[PDB]
Design a protein around this ligand. Structure first.
Ligand SMILES: Nc1ncnc2c1ncn2[C@@H]1O[C@H](COP(=O)(O)OP(=O)(O)OP(=O)(O)O)[C@@H](O)[C@H]1O
Ligand SMILES: Nc1ncnc2c1ncn2[C@@H]1O[C@H](COP(=O)(O)OP(=O)(O)OP(=O)(O)O)[C@@H](O)[C@H]1O
Ligand SMILES: *C(=O)CCCC[C@@H]1SC[C@@H]2NC(=O)N[C@@H]21
Ligand SMILES: [Mg+2]
Ligand SMILES: [Mg+2]
Lengths: 592, 70, 482
C-alpha cells in the first residue's frame, strides 16, 4: 500500500525533519511526545500530536505498546522511527509490520543481520569488502587474543559483538594487558548488552572515519549518493562532519562506492542506510559498519548531491523503484556542526538547562535543523543535541569561510554548548589542511586539539567587580557607534554613590555546599549529585561497603554517572530502585 | 584590582574619540562629589509628634529605636 | 588596489548580505545608518558602524557627502552601494572614484549610458539584440505618437527615457487617449525625474519578464550565470521570482544567453548586472533593460548556479579576471518570495508597524535573507521589503512543495505582509503550470488573480567637543544617569 499518514516515532530535530518531509510529500503527520516534550517544536509542528506519557525514554519512546497505540488512535498508516530509540530494533520493525503499518525502514532481517557485528563481518567478507585484519569469529579466551596479537602485532582492539556508542571497544597496546582487557570486555558487554561475545582486530592508530550514503530500493537497485568524512569525534561520537569526503584518491573513492553497493546487495538491504569505513594512515580502507537507519549527518549529503533522503525513504517504503539511476555528482562542499548542550570547557560533559536565547545563523549557504527555540528547556532525560548547522559552499575553502561567518553569528544562551569548539576547529590549521591532506583523526579532539575553551559560567557573578550593577548605552563619537557599559557606582569626576551607608562589596560565594577544600561532610546520606534516572543499583540493604564502592549508576543526558560510597559502613536505608527518576539532593541511602 | 571599569563592548575608538568620550562622561558625572556627612539633627522629628498610649509597644520599637539608632 | 575594508552604503537586507560576503572574504565591513535604523540588524552585524544622522533617505543614505565622510572617518577603502539609493547614480560612482576608493560597481560611463533608455536602445541595436518595434529617438509630440500607433497598431507604451521604478510607463490602448496620456506623461516625467524625454514602442499584451544574470570582467570576459523569471509583478514591481526561467525553449535560452553577452560587451560593462527582457505570448524575445547593479533577485541564481555573486563583485572590483570560464549549469530550481509590508487585502497598500514577532522558516532547502527581526519597527521612510525567503528543490515541483511548507511555517505578526498572497499563488494552478507552460504574466496579480486575501486587522543629547584639530559630536541618550 501507499503511505498516507506518517507517525514520527521520535523527538527533537529528527522529528521536525521528518514532519517537514511529510508536508513536502503532502502526507499527514503525527507527532508523539513524552511529558518533558509537551511544548517541543515538533509537537507543535505536526498535524497531530499524541502524549505517550512517562518522563523517560524507557517509559515513552521505547514502549512498543504506546507507539503502536498512538498509531492506531491517530489512524496513521506508516511509522518512521527517525534514529535512535527503536529505529534499529528489529523486533519493533516486526511489530510495526505485524500491525499492518508501513515500516519506513529496512527489513527486520536486515536490521538483525547488520546489527550483529560478526554476522555483518561475514556479510562483508562475502561481499569482498575491504576488511581490517581481524578474527573472523568471536575469540574464546585471552590466550586466543594473545595468539592473535602475536600474529598480527600491536595494538589490537577487542570489541563487543553487539556494542555501540563508543563503549563497544577497548584497545591493548602491550600484550600483558590482554587478559585484564578481555575480562573487562566480557563483563561489561554482558552487563550493558546482555551478550558476552568479543572479537579482536587490528587497531588503527590515527584513522579517518569515512562513510557512504546508500539509497537502495526493494527492487535491488542501489545508488551511492555520496560520502562523508566524520573524523572529528569525541568519545567516539561525531561532532563535525563534511561531504564529500576530502583528500581521497579516486581509487579509494571508487572502492568505497563499489564495496558499499556489494555489501548492501549481500545484506539484502533496502531503504536509506550508511556504510561506515575506516581509512588508515597508510590509506588502506577497511569496512567498519552498516547503519540501518537514516544518519544524523544525512543533510550534508542532501546539500551536496541534491537529493531529499527522507522523501527517498518514503518512496522506497512505498515500494517504488529508484528514480535516481546513477550516483550523483557532488556540487560544492558542506559541513555539519552538531550543537550539543555540552561544555567543551569541562571535557564535553552534557548538562541540562534553559535555552534563554537561540539565534540561528541565516543567509547564504546556511541551513539550520533545530529541535529547540528560545524558551525551550533541556531536561536530563534525552540526548544533548539541540540542533545541527549545515554550511555549504562552492569549495571546501568557501565552506570553511562561510562556516566561520555562520558560527560567529550563532548565539545560544542559558546553557553550555560546543559552539566555541566549532569556532576553534573551523579556524584550526590541523583541520584546514594543506590542500592535499589534513591532520585530524578520530582521536584528535581528545589527544591533539589545544583545548582553550573557558568553562561555562553563564551570567553568574563570580568576582567582586561582577556584583556591581551595570548599564549599557550607545554613544556616537564622530559618528562611530560605541556600546559602553557603565558601572552603577562610577566615581568619575564629580560622580559618586560609591557606597550607600553600610553597603559592602565582596566576592559572592558559589551556590555549592561548603568550601571546595573538602568533598563532603561526615554525614551518612548518599545523595544524588544530579537529576537523572537510577539505571543500576549495585548494593542491597544490609550490605557492608567501603569508601569508593559503587552504590548506583545514574543516567543523565544518556550518559552513565557512578555514585559511590563516600565512607565505610552498612547500607542502612536504600531508597531507590532501578528505573526510578531521581532529583539532585535526593537521599539514595545512608551509610552507617 | 576589583573596581568595576567602564567597558567599550562594541566599537574601537581612536584615541581622540576615547578622549572626547571620557571628557564628556566625566563632565556628566556629578552631584555627590566627596562623601560629605549630613549632620544629625533630631529636633522636631515626626516620631516625637505622635500620640502613644502609655503602654504602646511602639514606644520601644518606633520611638526609642528612632532616637537611639545611629 | 585591492579591497581591504568595504563600506556598505545601503540598509536592511542587502546591507546584511554584503556584510556577510565581506566576512566570508575576510574583509572588514563598515555599516552606515540613518536614525530610524539605529538598531537595525546590519548596524550590529557590521564590524564598524557610523551614524549618518537624518530621518529620511534624502537626509541620509542619498547624501554623497555623508557617505564619503563616513568612508573617510572609518578608513574604508571600497564602497559597495547595494541596490537602489546611489547604486546607479553615475555621479556618486564618479565621486567615489575621485575620492580614490574602490567603487564596487560598473563604470560611471556604463551606468550613464545604460540608464538612458534611448542610448540603451542604441547599444542594444548595435549589439543586434532583439528589440520591440519603437522609435529610435524620443517622440516630440502626440502627433508623432499617433502616427506610430497608426503604423504599428495599438496598444502602445509611452515611456520616460529617464527614471523608472514602475512609474515610467503609460499605455495608450486606442488613438483617442494618446494626446492626454502623452502630455500627462511628459509633465509627470518632468516632475518626477527632471527630464521630459519620452519614447513610444509596441506594448506587449501578456509578456513574461525574463532576465539574464551577467558577471563581466574588467578584462572583457563575460559569463551568464543563469536566466531568471520575474513575471509575477504588481505595480510593475517584482513580487515572486524563480530560476532558471521555466518553460523557455532551448532557442530562447540561447539567444538570451548570447544577446546578454553581446549587449554587455558592447556597452563595455563590467561587474554584476542583469539584462532584462520581455517574452510575448508569440514567444518573441525583446530586450527591455540593463540593470547596472546587483539584482534584488540574485539569491535564486546563487542557489541554482553555485556562484556567490557579491564575492564575484569583489573580485571584479579587485580587477581579477573571472575564474568562472563557462556559463554554469543550473542544478535545481529556486523561488524567491519578497516579504513586503504590503496588505494584499487592501490592494497591496504599504502599512508601517511593529514587527512584534518574526519566525523565519528553517530546514531543508530554505534560505532567509532578512533586514528585520522580532522587535523591529517599520516606518514609511523606506521600501516595504522586510526579507526574502528563498526556497530550492531538485525540480520545480519539489521547490513548490517545499515553498508551501516554508510559507506555512513562516510567522510574522504586527503588520500586514504579502505572505497570504505567496501562500495562495504557490497553490494556484496559474503558477504551478501544466508542465510545459504556465499562465502568469506581468499583469496577472492586478487582474485575473482571485484576491481572496482578507484585509489585515526622549531625543538624544549632543555635545560638540573639539580634540586637537577635529570637531567631534558626541551623542548620548537623553536620560544618561551616569
Ligand atoms: N579497529 C578500530 N581501530 C580504531 N578505531 C576504531 C576501530 N573500530 C572502531 N573504531 C572507532 O569506533 C568508532 C565507532 O565504532 P563503531 O562504528 O564500531 O561503533 P558504533 O558507532 O557505536 O556502532 P553502532 O552502530 O553499533 O552503535 C569509529 O568511528 C572509530 O572511531
Ligand atoms: N514594452 C513593454 N510592454 C509591456 N510591459 C512593459 C514594457 N516595458 C516595460 N514593461 C513593464 O515595465 C516593468 C519593467 O519596466 P522597466 O524596466 O522600464 O522598469 P523601471 O521602472 O525602469 O524599473 P527598474 O529599472 O528598477 O527595473 C515590467 O512590469 C514590464 O512588464
Ligand atoms: C535519544 O535521545 C534520541 C536519539 C539520539 C541519539 C542517537 S544514538 C544513535 C545516533 N547516533 C548519535 O550520535 N545520535 C543518535
Ligand atoms: Mg558507527
Ligand atoms: Mg527592470
Amino acid at each position: 500500500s501507499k503511505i498516507s499518514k506518517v507517525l514520527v516515532a521520535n523527538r527533537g530535530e529528527i522529528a521536525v525533519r521528518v514532519i517537514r518531509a511529510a508536508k513536502d510529500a503532502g502526507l499527514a503527520s503525527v507527532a508523539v511526545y513524552a511529558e518533558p516534550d509537551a511544548d517541543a517544536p515538533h509537537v507543535r509542528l505536526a498535524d497531530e500530536a499524541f502524549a505517550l506519557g512517562g518522563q523517560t525514554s524507557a517509559e515513552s519512546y521505547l514502549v512498543f505498546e504506546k507507539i503502536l497505540d498512538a498509531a492506531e488512535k491517530s489512524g496513521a498508516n506508516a511509522i518512521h522511527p527517525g534514529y535512535g530509540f527503536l529505529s534499529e530494533n528489529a523486533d519493533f520493525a516486526q511489530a510495526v509490520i505485524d500491525a499492518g503499518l508501513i515500516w519506513i525502514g529496512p527489513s527486520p532481517q536486515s536490521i538483525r543481520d547488520l546489527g550483529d557485528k560478526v554476522t555483518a563481518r561475514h556479510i562483508a567478507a562475502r561481499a569482498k569488502a575491504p576488511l581490517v585484519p581481524g578474527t573472523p569469529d568471536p575469540v574464546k579466551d585471552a590466550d586466543e587474543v594473545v595468539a592473535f596479537a602475536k600474529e598480527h602485532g600491536v595494538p589490537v582492539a577487542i570489541k563487543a559483538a553487539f556494542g555501540g556508542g563508543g563503549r563497544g571497544m577497548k584497545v591493548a597496546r602491550t600484550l600483558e594487558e590482554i587478559p585484564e582487557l578481555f575480562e573487562s570486555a566480557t563483563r561489561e558487554a554482558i552487563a550493558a548488552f546482555g551478550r558476552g561475545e568479543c572479537f579482536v582486530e587490528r587497531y588503527l592508530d590515527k584513522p579517518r572515519h569515512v562513510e557512504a550514503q546508500v539509497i537502495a530500493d526493494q527492487h535491488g537497485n542501489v545508488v551511492v549518493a555520496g560520502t562523508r568524512d566524520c573524523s572529528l569525534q569525541r568519545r567516539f561520537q561525531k561532532l563535525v562532519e563534511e561531504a564529500p569526503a576530502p583528500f581521497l584518491t579516486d581509487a579509494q573513492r571508487k572502492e568505497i562506492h563499489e564495496s558499499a553497493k556489494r555489501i548492501c546487495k549481500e545484506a539484502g538491504y533496502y531503504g536509506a542506510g550508511t556504510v561506515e569505513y575506516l581509512v588508515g594512515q597508510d590509506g588502506l580502507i577497511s569496512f567498519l559498519e552498516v547503519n540501518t537507519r537514516l544518519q544524523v549527518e544525512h543533510p550534508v549529503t542532501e546539500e551536496t548531491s541534491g537529493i531529499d533522503l527522507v522523501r527517498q525513504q518514503f518512496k522506497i517504503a512505498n515500494g517504488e523503484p529508484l528514480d535516481i539511476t546513477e550516483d550523483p555528482t557532488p556540487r560544492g562542499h558542506s559541513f555539519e556542526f552538531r550543537i550539543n548542550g555540552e561544555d567543551a570547557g569541562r571535557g564535553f560533559l552534557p548538562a541540562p538547562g534553559p535555552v534563554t536565547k537561540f539565534v540561528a545563523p541565516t543567509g547564504p549557504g546556511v541551513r539550520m535543523d533545530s529541535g529547540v527555540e528560545t524558551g525551550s528547556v533541556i531536561g536530563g532525560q534525552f540526548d544533548s543535541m539541540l540542533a545541527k548547522l549545515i554550511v555549504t559552499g562552492a569549495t571546501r575553502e568557501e565552506a570553511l569561510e562561510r562556516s566561520r561567518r555562520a558560527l560567529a553569528e550563532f548565539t545560544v544562551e542559558g546553557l553550555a554548548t560546543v559552539i566555541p569548539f566549532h569556532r576553534a576547529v573551523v579556524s584550526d590549521p590541523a583541520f584546514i589542511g594543506d590542500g592535499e591532506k589534513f591532520d585530524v583523526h578520530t582521536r584528535w579532539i581528545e589527544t591533539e586539539w589545544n583545548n582553550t575553551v573557558e568553562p561555562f559560567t553563564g551570567g553568574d557573578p563570580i568576582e567582586e567587580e561582577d556584583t556591581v550593577p551595570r548599564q549599557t548605552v550607545v554613544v556616537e563619537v564622530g559618528g562611530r557607534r560605541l556600546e559602553v557599559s557603565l558601572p552603577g557606582d562610577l566615581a568619575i569626576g564629580g560622580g559618586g554613590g560609591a557606597a550607600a551607608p553600610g553597603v559592602v562589596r565582596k566576592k559572592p560565594k558559589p551556590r555549592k555546599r561548603g568550601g571546595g577544600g573538602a568533598k563532603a561532610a561526615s554525614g551518612d546520606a548518599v545523595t544524588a549529585p544530579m537529576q537523572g534516572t537510577v539505571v543500576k543499583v549495585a548494593v542491597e540493604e544490609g550490605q557492608e561497603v567501603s569508601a569508593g564502592d559503587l552504590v548506583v549508576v545514574l543516567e543523565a543526558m544518556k550518559m552513565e554517572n557512578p555514585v559511590t560510597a563516600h565512607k565505610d559502613g552498612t547500607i542502612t536505608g536504600l531508597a531507590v530502585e532501578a528505573g526510578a527518576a531521581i532529583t539532585q539532593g535526593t537521599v539514595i541511602a545512608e551509610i552507617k | 584590582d576589583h573596581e568595576a571599569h567602564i567597558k567599550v563592548l562594541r566599537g574601537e575608538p581612536t584615541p581622540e574619540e576615547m578622549a572626547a568620550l571620557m571628557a564628556v562622561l566625566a563632565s556628566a558625572g556629578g552631584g555627590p562629589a566627596e562623601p560629605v556627612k549630613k549632620e544629625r539633627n533630631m529636633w522636631g522629628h515626626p516620631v516625637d509628634k505622635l500620640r502613644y498610649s502609655v503602654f504602646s509597644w511602639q514606644r520601644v520599637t518606633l520611638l526609642e529605636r528612632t532616637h537611639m539608632r545611629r
